[PDB]
Subunit: 410 residues, 4 copies
């Protein structure tokens, strides 16, 4: 019966996993706003505002800063499909799960995929990526900045200089790290950045902010091929082969956001309203302050976890501010502590996949949930569940260290 | 300055163009609802409900009825990229702008594209497409049901049996027509149908509902190749070559929406909620009642437009219930009427593009805006502007014919 | 019963061009959907303070005691009059419409001696007339409506405050209909108490009445001080006058709740406070001076189109409210039928006149969020379309021409 | 400057105090809906639905069941002002802070107030109040059902036969108990009931649900006096003296909610949508189950508190389901635990006023917050705060008793 389909009623949740995390209530309210037509002066104005705001968030002057209407990895694929002609040599430094995602996307683009690897969860040295760039001579360097599966944050500062010397295009996947970690697009010589909403932005998934450098926009303009239905007598192709997607042809997407207002697709009015608010909030607070906030609560969680008598995963010198790997004590079922946290406390913490499944928990402190009270509620909840499942902890230690960190820093 | 970016505030608009149209107030409210985690039992229940609900909207029992996170033409591209291997022949009976869009998507899929043509705005006879099928022998017949650029509805009822005899896969692009005109997916023997929100569903763009037949999923299953980051020892490749997109690989999307919950992408939580309401609302009213309503208000607009002394573009026998083409009668300027309708009445009427640009307005009566008061307000505003632009009409004649129609309809 | 036939909230789309309530600003509606906090959360006492300062701007006053009354517009009226009137106290009410009559009844229930002076609908009072009446009856209070939606008339107030200062009468005004759409210089005109509404030019769901009280008014109310037993302490004492005969409408305790003591009088309406906060915030972003000028522009555009349409108007146009218009129903046109066909066929609500003006005059409002160019245009064309269909002759395109001409000239 | 007055952004709070408490999000979404005119066919229908819905909530068939526009105590004042003529004798059984509220309201109606007392927090016997009714012969019996300030629930069942016997009108204030406790309006011979929204209904304050027995309406009709502005020749005053309030004259409010639709005031459109939702949700769950839910979580919290080695306040046999009085231990600062609970955990627990200030905390489990996870979160948080403040508990015991209670009941 159609009668037993009632109104939307999701249960209340504190999402402290690797994502998606709770949306900021201002972003949610802005999505309920009524729509206007595709080319209404207000809609074109709001599109132009989104560009200016995300230029601030990405820390770039790039003319082409916009949205791909799809989840984070649609942005990735849009950038790769637009920058990779079949046969092109691509270099992917793999330090986790999302390095393999780049490999697959690149392979679906028919690229020549060359990889370098370090174990989970470690990071790459600038020398390591320089030796690889000298060996294979790639068109693109395809990096993930923050990889949620390993909690590791790849240093990106010294890599852009390396890419300019050997004429490589420098792309990063910043969906996990943007807003909660430093990302200087221009200062670090980045050519393409793709992000997401559901990490530190806040932020339901469905949009991918991207930015393309002047060098990157030239490579795509050589690929120019306008869709037949909106092709005029004054449109002409570029010197190189077309992009093998109509939806992900970023040249046409650029022409939609540009003065031409080329009718590539109907922009996601609501998701645009959402995206505008995220960047607006991030810049009202300030990027530096926003990043400083993620560091404060990330560290407080670490110090809480360490005092609970728990090992942590990875090289902490390079840990993301917003993700923590927590080793499962042993004699303790991980799926059971996850089930108890959720059903009895309303707190979701992440499981790890593959070579870590049943070994490591992933606790995020991102965007809206990067607060003291989210950290405090999670630590007290985790400890309570562990004691109930017979894991001894020093009474008050985990909580004391959390307070000690919050007291000392302010 | 950041302070010169304020709270989202779009102007009050009546969207009577070819789309996007105004959303249902219930749909926008459901979007403000709080999020849950990707793998919360509530999320997987809501996905299971969306599948069930869209089977009723599409009029199908297809186990594989689900959402593509992207604009309407993303759901198309997901299907074409998943069904067409490089080389495979394809037939597109072009009768408007969106016939051309299908041609391009298939081109980017690396297909040999065959076309037949009728002039805007006419429609194909079953005999015309059968003679084309006999001639070129396509793997796929790729059709649009409602092409909003001509206001024409392609009859599909007999074509399904045509495709069964000569063993061709039958796809329709029903974004503009779903919910507003008849579409019996199973009874008409369709293999693939894709849609959009912003037309009759109501409806912000950003999501594309799709349904796949048992024959279709079998064809896509032959292309099996699981992404490296989420690949396990269980995953073996299909006998045919891979799909050349990660995001559009419907083989993996089916595995995400099915019982295995294969982690392909983070499903757009808010967009899913909107998608859920649209279907839930349509089925609460009843699909038949919903279509009948779209007919009634469309017909009243037609009779109102004709009595104003304005001619109607296209073959009226096959007109979409939800769209009308009104001819600009020379002397009067089309862009000037549109500007006045928008700036002074807050009403968007559609312009035309390409060949019909400057000749035809496209007035739509879809979804939430398929009401009497919307029609009355459009007809009244239109006649006021035309008269103000010194275009003579018989006083009260346009409104008279609309009232008489609504009187007779009772 | 059952329970399935009661579905999700789904009101029909309406353009409200009647006397009230009118369409609320969408930003206000969104603000109301926001999550709540505890009664004395630092954020809540903060927002209450924001609502005080913000409403000092909209009223045009420096008054410290500018706050909210939790109830519809007439609850703030009752709140003020129950607090200011001891039984037997003398009261003067210049009645020039239906709402002057409301002030009389409210005053009557406060057990006051109610003196009234009358001009016809829709005429307005002269300063000399109120002065002659004040000289006569010797009132403690002068009670006016600034804008009476029943007759569309706007009482000049500027000359009235001085009169009250010479004869020691307390000067109150009901500005629920006028605030935001017409000038109201609270402190400049020497007002003691003002009460407003949300649902008119503020926009604005009904259920809250903003009030402001001058330094002299608080003195009069604090003389009646008496704290409710449950929240009363040994440090509390009664004033030198009789208690206000109401617990809820005792404005002394409400003042104490909104003040630094935070005396627990009631649980302040959180949602309604978010809405009321927005209304004032939005009004001051655009600017009150521009808010008033906008109402004037679109209000005048309505009357020019109505006149071109061949219709008569009600009352003195010299003093007409910026936000409403009285339109004489032609003969033998049915007013109820026109209203029925405006609502059911165009999704536009136009007002009927109650009492001695029913079936004689419509009340068409151009208020707050609907004080827009596109609202005026749609109402006029719908009326002309409804009228002509009921077989009433109009000059073709005349109504719209005069309206379009007005917007052209003003730009 | 108006630029430093930004958009509404309240901090996330788990309200576990005496009230107001966090609202159910479905009710919040209902308030964001757009408004219709006072006398719109849709407004009166929703009003008629509201009347029917609350009849189900109050457990009555009373035709005069409706809303007062104002907070809980405005509805109390409405019922008292309409029923009480000056000089009338009234009896108020006082057992807490709100007992005194009824005394003050009756006093300002110029009634003679008679009282009997029990210490905080005891309850009245049928005999105690029957002795008093014989003694003073009251017109009204004025009782609080659940007094949050003491956590005590007065039995009303036997009080209805006592009132009917000695010919007294029986009123009660049920703002705290309604929804979370049994209330049989008709079965308990109740003449008038008033409640609020922000306790168990859920529910921001601003509306007062009332119900009036056939007996009560006769008494209010005798006092008939219609406001001069909405008075016609077809009206005549009743035999009794007028109700000394315009806004609170329940004779006129009845006429506004009846067939005549007498224009007494403009009904709060936004709040009525909320109150319409609140009643709908409670009846969708089913009042019996709702009451049962409130008891489960109330019982859970207590056990955990008792297992924490904390004393409790009041006669536990008669405790409200949705409130707990927790005695503040020697040396632990009552107001300091509150600061740490709110600022560091984002959880509000109630302070006591009057003869319990500094001695007792009030912890509520009401409406939307009567869930398992709100109980768990608050318990672990309070324990963490107490522990940090050097107050020894038996590690794990407080969570154990709660977990054991939930496991046993499932």
């Amino acid at each position: 019966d159609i009668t037993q389909f009632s109104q939307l009623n999701p249960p209340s949740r504190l999402l402290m996993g690797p994502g998606p995390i709770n949306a900021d209530p201002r972003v949610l309210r802005a999505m309920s706003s009524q729509l206007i037509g595709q080319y209404d002066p207000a809609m074109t104005h709001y599109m132009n505002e989104v560009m200016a705001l995300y230029r601030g968030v990405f820390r770039t002057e790039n003319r082409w800063t916009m949205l791909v209407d799809g989840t984070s990895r649609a942005g990735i694929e849009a950038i790769l499909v637009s920058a990779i002609r079949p046969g092109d040599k691509v270099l992917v430094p793999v330090f986790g799960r999302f390095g393999h995602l780049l490999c697959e996307i690149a392979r679906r683009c028919r690229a020549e995929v060359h990889t370098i690897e370090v174990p989970w969860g470690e990071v790459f040295t600038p020398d390591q990526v320089e030796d690889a760039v000298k060996r294979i001579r790639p068109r693109l360097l395809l990096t993930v900045q923050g990889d949620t599966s390993t909690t590791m944050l790849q240093p990106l500062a010294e890599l852009g200089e390396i890419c300019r010397r050997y004429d490589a295009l420098f792309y990063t996947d910043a969906t996990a790290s943007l807003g909660g970690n430093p990302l200087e697009t221009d200062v670090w010589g980045l050519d393409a950045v793709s992000a997401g909403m559901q990490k530190c932005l806040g932020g339901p998934s469905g949009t991918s902010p991207i930015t393309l450098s002047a060098r990157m926009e030239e490579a795509i303009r050589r690929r120019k091929c306008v869709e037949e239905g909106i092709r005029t007598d004054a449109h002409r192709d570029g010197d190189e082969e077309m992009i093998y997607s109509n939806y992900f042809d970023l040249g046409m997407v650029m022409d939609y956001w540009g003065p031409e207002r080329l009718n590539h697709h109907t922009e996601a009015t609501t998701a645009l309203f959402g995206a505008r608010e995220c960047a607006r909030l991030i810049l009202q607070e300030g990027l530096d302050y926003g990043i400083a906030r993620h560091k404060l609560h990330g560290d407080a969680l670490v110090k809480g976890i360490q005092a609970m008598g728990l090992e942590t995963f990875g090289d902490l010198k390079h840990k993301m501010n917003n993700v923590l790997g927590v080793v499962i004590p042993q004699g303790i079922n991980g799926d059971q502590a996850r089930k108890l946290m959720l059903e009895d406390f309303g707190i979701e913490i992440g499981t790890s996949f593959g070579p870590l499944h049943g070994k490591v928990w992933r606790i995020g402190t991102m965007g809206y949930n990067a607060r003291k009270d989210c950290v405090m509620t999670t630590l007290s909840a985790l400890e309570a569940v562990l004691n109930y499942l017979k894991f001894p902890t020093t009474q008050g230690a985990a909580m004391q260290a959390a307070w000690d960190h919050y007291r000392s820093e302010r």
